[PDB]
Design a binder for this molecule. Structure first.
Ligand SMILES: Nc1ncnc2c1ncn2[C@@H]1O[C@H](COP(=O)(O)OP(=O)(O)OP(=O)(O)O)[C@@H](O)[C@H]1O
Ligand SMILES: Nc1ncnc2c1ncn2[C@@H]1O[C@H](COP(=O)(O)OP(=O)(O)O)[C@@H](O)[C@H]1O
Ligand SMILES: [Mg+2]
Lengths: 743, 58
């Protein structure tokens, strides 16, 4: 749309001094060949060059060297701008400093070998901070034009006095100037990034717009989210893009009990930041430093909140200073600090999803060498709840474990490690999976459990139940477009009920692995407390954790304990049980937007559960897990004995046929008993072999016969009759039968 | 100390009784201890992995 817009492209033969541009864009820009122009770059870096006409250069692209990419901090395909340099004059004196690593090892004078031929009749425009690489000698040498006169744009001419000697340059400073953090190093928060960009970059870029509309940019930025999510990273990145001085503030370090030290600390910090008027203040852990003045007993904290209020009131002063605060919990901050003019705008930064965490992995591993085998999509999929900081830790641990794997490859005896053997060591996908297993998501460290180690193949039978659970967890998250098209929200509730040992907990643990969604398991009575209002507090905090980790599967094993018919027990904590039930009712279906939180309940006694718990909208689908039938019993036996080495002569079909009333637990008991009999036989055989010195490949059929002689039915007939009665009550509640539409 | 370590190539620093001079800033008797902890954090972030100096603490 504009002639200035340009796409970065490589230069075949153009040096770092000049660039080649397409002739149609030359005429569109109304610029002559050899005109001194300026190119903009990221992090506010500019490169002055001589423009030229090239046929190979594309219309929408600018051909430019790699060192010019370093100078402008740009990469291939990026967007840059070109502007005519006005009132260009020849340089009278330029102070140019080679890098400190380049000077070492060069016997000859750097100016004569490199600077003099390059700058003899140069006519090459340069700007302060520009760096160019000169080929020649035993090693090519990099030169930085630190000073130019006239500043900041001048033309190099033979009359200009050029001397390499001077104050030594610093490699670390240039490396930092190259390795600064920008918006590109942030991923997965593009809507929050767009908000913050419109907040900060814009008023600096177009202040006349705000002046013409007569509004001032917001002087307060609050960032709230779980820790490690990048609240510090955005603040650090903004200062580089919009040239400023990042001034970090730690909440704990400012806080002091010296009776008035903390207020002086904040006031000094604000004064120091205002001194460097293009400044950004970052107040990390604002929640600790700023509680409610009335709520907190501590007078130091109420005074520090009041001082922060006073500083925020006078913060603007029509100055470039802006303040960004990070808090994990936003409600703990004093409501006065929530007002307009002080942190008036609050931005929520959430746990990254699959795409955002993939972007984080990409940007962290851009420097790391990546094999063709490794796919970071899979690494993002497996990290169901990892945070960006956790992702960075995972990336580092991966390479460290790769080094550990290649310890045996490196003999490390040589004084210098051989480069050819160096080449062999590289990262692998097994490395990523192992480091990922070792790495732990910090989002739900509180709810951490050992590996379920159960898959859908581990469960025999229940094919329809398996399909329904997979659809439940998968359709809303993988296909939200279809739910938007058909206009209705997904159902997010299932209650498993049935006799003990039939696979309800097994189904939940199978969900845990094969859903690619976070899983929180709540043992039934675990959430209750002896204190007056803390059981429902635990309920609402577990639901809050579920909402944060969406899509999450919230599983209540033995739900009949936490959920009862209200008023059933008068002495159950003086109505604390009923209050817990009411809290769960409000948390499942209340006046809050529904998240991707799927609540699964397992119970042996469904008739005692509160009817309000079981209505559609809370545990929508009531699924009965009955005693397996003969085919399902064959499936259970096959699932249990798939891992075991079992003889072919054994007939699992006959076992399933005879075990009429056996549950899955009973059949697993049969398999375990047969294996124990085999263990006894094999160990006794080994003892006999040892005795005769001084075997059994697969479990035989007679072992299973003895195990059956030790088999038993666990679930009584009265209990299963009760479960059938509950199911029949549901069916009678439906009414009628075989709903058929007329014509 | 850190300046001398980054000066020589390579270098190793050892810090015995790190907990003695680097306690929690949340629970600290003197503000000077908070200052030394913060300065230790700043100089810890000061190295850019290129000085190749490993700091050890007991
Ligand atoms: N259909 C099945 N397929 C495979 N194993 C099963 C099946 N049903 C039960 N089991 C076995 O039962 C054991 C545990 O059962 P599980 O925890 O799923 O029972 P449950 O139905 O939730 O009962 P409870 O009400 O007593 O908690 C495991 O060893 C599991 O392998
Ligand atoms: N969205 C993100 N993209 C890339 N890196 C991230 C992101 N979020 C966090 N990090 C990593 O976290 C580290 C900074 O911690 P940070 O997340 O800022 O903590 P806090 O959440 O307390 O501000 C950086 O090293 C950075 O690599
Ligand atoms: Mg169970």
């Amino acid at each position: 749309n504009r002639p200035n817009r340009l796409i970065v492209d490589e230069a075949i033969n153009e040096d770092n001094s000049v660039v080649s541009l397409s002739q149609p864009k030359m005429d569109e820009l109304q610029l002559f060949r050899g005109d001194t122009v300026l190119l903009k770059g990221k992090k506010r870096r500019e490169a002055v060059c001589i423009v030229l006409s090239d046929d190979t250069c594309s219309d929408e692209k600018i051909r430019m060297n790699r060192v010019v990419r370093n100078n402008l901090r740009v990469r291939l395909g990026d967007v840059i701008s070109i502007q005519p340099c006005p009132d260009v004059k020849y340089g009278k004196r330029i102070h140019v400093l080679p890098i400190d690593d380049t000077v070492e090892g060069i016997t000859g004078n750097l100016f004569e070998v490199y600077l003099k031929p390059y700058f003899l009749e140069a006519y090459r425009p340069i700007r302060k901070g520009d760096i160019f690489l000169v080929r020649g000698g035993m090693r090519a040498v990099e030169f930085k034009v630190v000073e130019t006169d006239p500043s900041p744009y001048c033309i190099v001419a033979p009359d200009t006095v050029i001397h390499c000697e001077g104050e030594p340059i610093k490699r670390e400073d240039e490396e930092e100037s190259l390795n600064e953090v920008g918006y590109d190093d942030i991923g997965g928060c593009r809507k929050q990034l767009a908000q913050i960009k419109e907040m900060v970059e814009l008023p600096l870029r177009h202040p006349a717009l705000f002046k013409e509309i007569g509004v001032k940019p917001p002087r307060g930025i609050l960032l709230y989210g779980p820790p490690g999510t990048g609240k510090t990273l955005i603040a650090r990145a903004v200062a580089n893009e919009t040239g400023a001085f990042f001034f970090l503030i730690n909440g704990p370090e400012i806080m002091s009990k010296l009776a008035g030290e903390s207020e002086s600390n904040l006031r000094k910090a604000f004064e120091e930041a205002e001194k460097n008027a293009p400044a950004i203040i970052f107040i990390d852990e604002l929640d600790a430093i700023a509680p409610k003045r009335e709520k907190t007993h501590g007078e130091v904290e109420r005074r520090i909140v009041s001082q922060l209020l006073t500083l925020m009131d006078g913060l603007k002063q029509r100055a470039h200073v802006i303040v960004m605060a990070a808090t994990n919990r936003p409600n703990s901050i004093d409501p006065a600090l929530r007002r307009f003019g002080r942190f008036d705008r609050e931005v929520d930064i959430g746990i990254p999803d699959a795409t955002g965490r993939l972007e984080i992995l990409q940007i962290h591993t851009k420097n790391m060498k990546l094999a063709d085998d490794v796919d970071l999509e899979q690494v993002a999929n497996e990290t169901h709840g990892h945070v960006g900081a956790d992702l960075a830790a995972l990336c580092s641990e991966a390479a460290l474990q790769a080094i550990r794997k290649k310890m045996d490859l490196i003999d490390l005896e040589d004084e210098t490690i051989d480069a050819e053997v160096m080449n062999s060591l590289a990262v692998t996908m097994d490395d990523f999976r192992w480091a990922l297993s070792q790495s732990n998501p910090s989002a739900l460290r509180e709810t951490v459990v050992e590996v379920p180690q159960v898959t859908w193949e581990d469960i025999g039978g229940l094919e329809d139940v398996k399909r329904e659970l997979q659809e439940l967890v998968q359709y809303p998250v993988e296909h939200p477009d279809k739910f938007l098209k058909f206009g209705m929200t997904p159902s997010k509730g299932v209650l498993f009920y049935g006799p003990p040992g039939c696979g309800k907990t097994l189904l939940a643990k199978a969900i845990a692995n094969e859903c690619q969604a976070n899983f929180i398991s709540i043992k039934g009575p675990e959430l209750l407390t002896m204190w007056f209002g803390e059981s429902e507090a635990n309920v609402r905090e577990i639901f809050d954790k579920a909402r944060q980790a969406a899509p999450c599967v919230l599983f209540f094993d033995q739900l009949d304990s936490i959920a009862k018919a209200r008023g059933g027990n008068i002495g159950d904590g003086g109505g604390a049980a009923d209050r817990v039930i009411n809290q769960i009712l409000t948390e499942m279906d209340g006046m809050s937007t529904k998240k991707n939180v799927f609540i699964i309940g397992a119970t042996n006694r469904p008739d005692i559960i509160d009817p309000a718990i079981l209505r559609p909208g809370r545990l929508d689908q009531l699924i009965y897990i009955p005693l397996p039938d003969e085919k399902s019993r064959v499936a259970i036996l096959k699932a249990n004995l798939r891992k075991s080495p079992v003889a072919k002569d054994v007939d699992l079909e006959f076992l399933a046929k005879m075990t009429n009333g056996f549950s899955g637990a009973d059949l697993t008991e049969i398999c375990q008993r047969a294996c124990k009999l085999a263990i006894r036989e094999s160990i006794e055989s080994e003892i006999r072999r040892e005795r005769e010195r001084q075997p059994v490949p697969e479990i035989r059929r007679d072992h299973f016969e003895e195990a059956m002689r030790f088999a038993r039915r666990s679930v009584s007939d009265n209990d299963i009759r009760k479960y059938e009665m509950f199911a029949q009550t549901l069916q009678q509640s439906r009414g009628f039968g075989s709903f058929r539409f007329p014509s």
